[PDB]
Symmetry: C6
Subunit: 267 residues, 6 copies
């Protein structure tokens, strides 16, 4: 068992999606057939639909897709079940790992990814909106990665990070918090509909007050997502790391301190 990098698959799909006629649709793709899922997202005022593993079609409705849908959603077949999540007692939904001046969000993601892979889960990782990463990290890249993972034999998906999406929704401008709330709620709703555990990461480094943005996004994520994790402290001792974290679980409303340490895992 090993961790799958979904990055190149998103990159090749984006090349195929660079058509002048997406309204006609792009057929004969091989996105995946393990699960029957339909991903419907809003791009501007238009709707972009990912139908199973074969079709991707854009529609321009008479009324804006913003008024119609808002952000996006998933519809799954009644047969869709990720058995390995049940066996290892991992609940479907989205999780957020947020950090500020302390950092260590990528180090923690790699730690949790390797931990799940060692446990027996089929783990996928997609790197975006960060240095040394080819994917820019737009809302399209997030929904394309979510869909590619959903229709595939992927139990846990790691999206590192939402930096570009946060910027796209005006997060670095201080109407803004509503759009971030909407995105976070849609991502948790998606991971539930698709029966997958999605872990998203964010470091609002482009913001004026980085730690104040962390505190507000953490409060938002605490209500909108299954799990919200804030890195308070982070330090590296050669090949090992240690991080002082604050975790919120929506289920029991609890806010507890958790110390997480381990070795540096490469990606």
């Amino acid at each position: 068992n090993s961790i799958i990098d979904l990055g190149p698959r998103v990159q090749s799909l984006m090349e195929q999606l660079a058509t002048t006629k997406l309204e006609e649709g792009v057929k004969n793709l091989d996105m995946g057939s393990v699960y029957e899922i339909t991903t419907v997202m809003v791009l501007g005022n238009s709707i972009l639909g990912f139908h199973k593993g074969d079709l991707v079609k854009m529609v321009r409705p008479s009324v804006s897709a913003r008024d119609l849908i808002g952000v996006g959603y998933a519809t799954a077949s009644a047969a869709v079940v990720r058995q390995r999540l049940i066996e290892h007692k991992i609940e479907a939904g989205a999780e957020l790992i947020i950090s500020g001046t302390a950092g260590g969000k990528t180090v923690l993601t790699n730690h949790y990814a390797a931990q799940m892979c060692a446990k027996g889960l089929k783990v996928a990782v997609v790197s975006m909106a960060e240095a040394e990463r080819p994917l820019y990290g737009s809302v399209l890249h997030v929904f394309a990665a979510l869909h590619l993972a959903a229709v595939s034999d992927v139990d846990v998906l790691y999206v590192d990070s939402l930096r570009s999406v946060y910027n796209e929704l005006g997060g670095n401008l201080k109407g803004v918090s509503r759009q971030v709330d909407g995105m976070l709620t849609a991502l948790d709703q998606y991971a539930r509909a698709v029966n997958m555990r999605v872990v998203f990461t964010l470091n609002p480094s482009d913001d004026e007050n980085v730690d104040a943005a962390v505190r507000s996004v953490f409060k938002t994520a605490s209500a909108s997502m299954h799990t919200a994790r804030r890195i308070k402290s982070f330090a590296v001792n050669g090949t090992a790391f240690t991080a002082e974290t604050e975790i919120h679980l929506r289920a029991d409303r609890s806010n507890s301190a958790n110390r997480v340490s381990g070795d540096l895992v490469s990606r």
Copy 2:
């Protein structure tokens, strides 16, 4: 007797409304035939009309719909009368439940909805613009929910919340208060025309000064709507709640303090 959740019906209608030709119209719908009501709303510069339970058509008039209509209205036959509202002495119109840092607007909504259901009224609830809720809560979702309840056998409708509409009208930007006034008035005028009691909720949590926004929206709602209720204090004691509230009744201009307590009712 039980409370009806209109959310899934709004969601299915939005899927049907995702057409490239809304100018041609979407026929053979089954929105309801209890009351002959036509809902006319403005979407940008265009008009969206909900004709009885069968048709939904968009028109793009030569002059902007903003200059023509403004927000939206309802037209009905002289036979549109809700007998249960007369029997239980409940006046038609819109009501607002507003809260700030105290919260408890959803808990109060569920309390009043269960109270009306126990009284013998046909109660419908629609959830939107909040965490864990599928509906985004756009102006379209509010008018679609209003129309579905209007043409159906619904005496009282609860819309929780107007958070997205408030944001859409620039409420979180500080010309703004005029658009909020216009919406609130149109919502009361609608409920009177349709002869239904509609209860709207709002928590301006996306605003910079949340409690200052509550005080100004409460003053606006006091004139624009039949009743305006402000939650001053709210606390939960296990399975029970207690809320210190301020209520304004437009009929006698009175502003009185009201203590409301009960058990936590799920949705």
Copy 3:
């Protein structure tokens, strides 16, 4: 003799004007044939003309209607004379009733309207841009109400209020005062051309400094219109009211204090 509510007639005309082809014109209307009047108004860069009681047509001129006309005017045959205004010695032109934190502009309007009706004048009232009022109060609604009254047997018309028009012209933003001046002058010019007495009301409640906006609009109205009335104080004693007012008469340039009291008249 009784007061005519022009509101429903404006509402039905707006429904007929919701066409995709206003350039072709909307014929066979029955707006009125007592006086041969043509109302020309500017809507954006386009011209909207109300020809007698039969036609309403939109033209999109090569040069903007803003440069061509500005706001709007009325053209009438030499036979347009309202005999009842001569008999009761009432001069044609527009008058403004402005109030701030004191309020009572609607109460004063109803008082003066009932006073004119009792005198023997054919009085019409149009309610817009206010709570419990179906008409939004756009510039179109103002010009439609003016035209409907002008072509009919109406001696005095009351427009309560100009709140939406004031907002539309950027009055609540602080180039703005020029557009308000232009509107006020056009309305006085219209009433004189049409030989009708028109009484407009305004409460800049959407403004940051409401009483400072009242003082500046009152100074503008003092030059732009026949009469300008400012409510300084207003109080209700059961079924009776009393208001301390400041009135400006353009004819003698005089600014005098006037106490006006009476009973509460419903609309």
Copy 4:
């Protein structure tokens, strides 16, 4: 001999110019044939030309008229000479009468117009951008007045006022002073080309600091125009007036104080 009011002639021309096909041209007009003059003006990015007394045509050039022309000019035959200006030793060019909080610009205009009429000159007056005046006072209204006076037997033209043009050019916003400079230079250049004396008036009453705007526009007009006159003080004693004025003559660069008094002349 009497003063001509050009206002109604500008108003009727604007009605004729309200065509959907100004690119095709509006022929068979009777603007005037005393002098062969062509007026070229810029309206947005388009060019509007007034050819003698017969044609008015709009052209939409490939490059913006702002880059091509800027504001506007006049072309005339070598025979354009106003003999009465030579006989009474009056030089061609534009003159500005500016006032602030002191007022009296209209009273002074009427005083100078009556003085020129009594001298033996053919005087024309156009009232615009002010209370009790039908013309809005756009750049179109100014150029149409200039052209009607130029092609006709008019020695001196009084334009009261440039309030709307000043506002149109962003004068009440504080790039702005360049557009005001450009207009003032174009108006003096026009009057010289057409061999007519044109007197313009301005009161920047829509400006935040009215007297500071007067001081800067007066400094600009001192260089851009033949003469610039600033009203420092103004008072009315029954039927008589007295004004303390500051006049700048471009010819000798001199800035001198001038006391002007007389009787109130109606328009």
Copy 5:
């Protein structure tokens, strides 16, 4: 020998360029055939090319002209050599004469132009963006004048002034300094390519802090152009003038004080 005024030639070319089909081109012009030069400039997102003395054509490229070219340039055969500049040891390039509150930029320009004319050079002057000057002074007028002087037997060109271009590039707004830098570099690059000495003048009189704008434009011009001259002091004694100036020479990086006096030369 005498100084040539290029103003009327630029004015007549602009009249010929007022076509609806500049994409087709304006042929059979007689701009000049002394030197084979092509002037390419950017107008918005479009390209305007002046080909030798015969053609002027506009192209609308698929990608913006801003990304493609930036400002504008000149292409010429190496046979473009102005022998009189070699004989009188004058280097090709652009020169800036900048003044603030002191003034005297026009007086200095006329002084230097008469000095060069007396030396034996073919001198041309173009007056724009100033009072009593028909040319508005847009970027088009600057490039048209440069091209008309470049293809003709002109050794030294004087462009008084760049006031409108400075305003057009947002110079009077405080991204702005980059556009001014780009223009100044393109103008020096042009003069070098065309092998002509061009002297530009500027007085940022439309700026809030005129002398602070002079200091920053002088620093920019010191790097961007061959020579930058700042008028520190200026006074007129009847028919004579004296100016205290600061000159920067790019060649030796030196910044020295220079006193320049002479008689007032008319234009």
Copy 6:
């Protein structure tokens, strides 16, 4: 061996790219055939592709190129390997030379370019966004130069400077840092894909706080690029220079002080 100036080749390509039909493509170019590389960039919402040495075609996809790609990339055959970089142990990737008030970025670039040329590498230099340089320095000019150097026999490329790109991405406005991050990452990713060493230079001289902009861009470049070099001090002693520099190496995370001195090398 000598240094190649790619500037004129970029200039000629831009002239060929000034077509109205870039969607049809511009064929039969001779950009280079040493390496099979395709450069894909985003221009607004459109995609501009440089296919090997023959084609350049623009596509306007249904969804924005911003959501699809973001900035731009390079695709190459497995045979794309620059043997001289292996022989001289030089790693592929982008490097940044940043300076503020100290200057000397061009002097250092010329020093390093001559040093690499003397070593035996095929060195190319492209001058843009600076005084005395014909290329404006847009994102198009950067990618055109990148592609032209990529498909050719060029081991090391010097791009002096990114001043215009920094301005284009809103770098001089204080959402901005995300776009600068994205560009810097894309350029490093490009250089790695194309297997070339690219050295970029930047002096944020158009910024309000130049040295504060240097400190933040240096921190960004430290993560986004292979190497980041900051000029702390710089002085010229006749024909020799000396610069106190701070260098960051991404490989070992180290931040060390480096003194670099040499002779002034012309370009």
